[PDB]
Amino acid sequence: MEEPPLLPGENIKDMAKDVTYICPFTGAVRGTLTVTNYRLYFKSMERDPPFVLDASLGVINRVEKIGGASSRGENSYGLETVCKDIRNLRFAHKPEGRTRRSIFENLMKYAFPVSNNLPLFAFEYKEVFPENGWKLYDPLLEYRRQGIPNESWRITKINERYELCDTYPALLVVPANIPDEELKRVASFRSRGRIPVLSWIHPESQATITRCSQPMVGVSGKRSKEDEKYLQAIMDSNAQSHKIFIFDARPSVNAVANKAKGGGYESEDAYQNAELVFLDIHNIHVMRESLRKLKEIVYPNIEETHWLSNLESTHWLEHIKLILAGALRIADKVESGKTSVVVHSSDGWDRTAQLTSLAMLMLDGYYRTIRGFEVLVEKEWLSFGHRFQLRVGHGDKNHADADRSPVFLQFIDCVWQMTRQFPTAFEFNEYFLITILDHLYSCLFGTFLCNSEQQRGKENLPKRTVSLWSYINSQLEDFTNPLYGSYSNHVLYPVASMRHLELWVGYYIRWNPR
């Protein structure tokens, strides 16, 4: 029997007999196509181990009608689902079978519930696990683990009602001597009120990683005494009071383009004890275009003759390299330079989240534990306002949205690169990372829904959805790396080179039955 298995809360919405799945690798196979509220299940008993294709609906970007009435070929009348996970799926229907319309309509409806005024499956997934992923991350405790608040850094509550910055977490760590009303001001100079706050502190040197958005300098060199005092306050916090380093993730010309617009960067006149460096990491649009090119040379057949040159033309591994190289520069400046660094971009959610979290992964072994990693994600990504729902387009039929970009995917890709370079340094395994990427799109859990901490609170995700961590941690074994424990040498320093970075076959090329 060709019925899909059903998760608690999941159910069949449509079924189709005698549909043909056209496997680019194994030719065609006739079986039964089923659509649930969660998934797209195809299964044929026309083979042996029965043929099964199980794909969560969340990965579907587009559903196209293939062929028409004037389609007289064989397997020319059908559907094609364009996926988010580096594949496209296509099925053939018989016109007289009268199933294509029903399937097409149910796919459109259940793969894009938000566009059809329906819930995302996460709200109807009523499975129950022993551990509760929602209680895993505790801002206050994480800060405490870092030896936060101390004399130099305090915790303010000025953003508890999300009034200071609605895309920031409720609790913020700032210089022990900067008053709430002053912060209220730096917030006026920083884009979207995303002021420089603490992300990490060296246990020893008390060199810091702070994060923020760009300074609203504009065409005319606008300055903020308070912002300048703020960055100064950050420097006065290092017991070996060098200076400051400001890493602008952006290429130079982008930073300037932004300045025309109203944004900009910290000049050497305005911020003196500050050294600014541009990391040349392009925007969300460039990264979307890069992944698009990659999917083409990867998905169905790879053209072996020109793989290397084709891969180069995508500029994928290059973006990955600049992101890791950037994280490296930050880590080194903190660790070896004993210097505090301020990280930003334009808005400070995207590239900034990539940099802080990777540098933090290089510097703090805690973040390399399975559970530590989950916290890093909850912290740097979720709590700090990476716009997941927007960047992925959860249950939204508008596949051409310019807001869609694989920012988090790049991050995970960079994390994977480090596991390759340091196979004993991480407690989690590849499966763990790939699983994370699958549920990033699945919308089975509420972990990657909404766009800010505030929103997830108002939506009451902890109570209405299951945390991905609940599933993962009540399972640890599937996601544990056996070689772990030995990275006594505590600062990871991967090599960001085109010769040391590989294309993540495990993820981008996993559909081939080899």
Ligand SMILES: CCCC(=O)O[C@H](CO[C@@H](O)CCC)COP(=O)(O)O[C@@H]1[C@H](O)[C@H](OP(=O)(O)O)[C@@H](O)[C@H](OP(=O)(O)O)[C@H]1O
């Ligand atoms: C004051 C200027 C502010 C700004 O961000 O402007 C730029 C655009 O300008 C043109 O398109 C028009 C020029 C007339 C974009 O400048 P730019 O740096 O090229 O690009 C940003 C950057 O990628 C942000 O992430 P982050 O900085 O955290 O890594 C995204 O969130 C933002 O998109 P979204 O949030 O709106 O979806 C995107 O526009």
